[PDB]
Amino acid sequence: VNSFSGYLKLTDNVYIKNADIVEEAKKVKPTVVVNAANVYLKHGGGVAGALNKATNNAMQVESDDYIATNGPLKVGGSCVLSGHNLAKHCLHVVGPNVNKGEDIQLLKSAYENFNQHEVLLAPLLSAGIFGADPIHSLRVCVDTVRTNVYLAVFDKNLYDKLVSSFL
Ligand SMILES: OC[C@H]1C[C@@H](O)CN1c1ncnc2[nH]ccc12
Ligand SMILES: [Cl-]
């Protein structure tokens, strides 16, 4: 039993809700919140900009130190940093950004990072301003993640479309 509330069950391990991931994190304080990151951990907009804003820019400050020490992430890769006021940990995961010309086959690799954590509050990878097809991303999530994932989908129209089209 966990404290996630109001989620529609999709499969054995994947759940979905129409909510802002920031608000789900503020309410649940999950062990792991996933950020839809880029390789530079520049949290400018979308999920990343919203999460970072909710930390009063502390996520960005921590991220800049991480990059100064370690260099950029790989597309498809991840790192674990603090969850600040929102969660115990933040798993920064880089899905491909097709608006930047990055490669969509890397979406499965990106979701594989979730399997290192038993339970996660996560956004739909490569959705929104990353420019990928959200229906495809949900399919990759369900077919790749084996641990328990709670997907928070901010956009109501998208949530409705995702549920109604799920196979
Ligand atoms: O709607 C699903 C995706 C794609 C784009 O619409 C934004 N987005 C989010 N999902 C979950 N939490 C979020 N907080 C802020 C934005 C956001
Ligand atoms: Cl977005």
- Domain with residue 21: its CATH number is 3.40.220.10
- Give the residues surrounding ligand 1 with Cβ less than 6 Å away: 20-22, 46-47, 50, 123-124, 127-128, 152-155, 158
16 in Cβ contact with 10 (< 8 Å):
yes
Q: Mutual orientation of helices 46-54 and 21-28 as an angle, nearest 10°? A: 40
CB atoms within 10 A of CB 34: 32
Q: Using CB atoms within 10 A of its CB, is residue 29 exposed (0-12), middle (13-18) or buried (19+)? A: middle
The Å distance, Cα 72 to ligand 1 centre, comes to: 24
The reply to whether 1 falls in a domain is: no
Per the DSSP assignment, residues forming a β-bridge with 92 are 35, 79
What's the chain's length in residues? 167
Q: Give the whole-angstrom CA distance, residue 157 versus residue 4.
A: 22
The reply to whether 3 falls in a domain is: no
Q: What is the count of structural domains for the chain?
A: 1
The technique by which this structure was obtained is: X-ray
Which residue do the tokens 């799920």 mark? 166
Closest ligand to C-alpha of residue 34 is: 1
User: Residue 133: which domain range?
Assistant: 8-163
The reply to whether 2 falls in a domain is: no
The Å distance, Cα 70 to ligand 1 centre, comes to: 28
The reply to whether 95 falls in a domain is: yes
Q: What is the resolution of this structure in A?
A: 1.0
The Å distance, Cα 1 to ligand 1 centre, comes to: 26
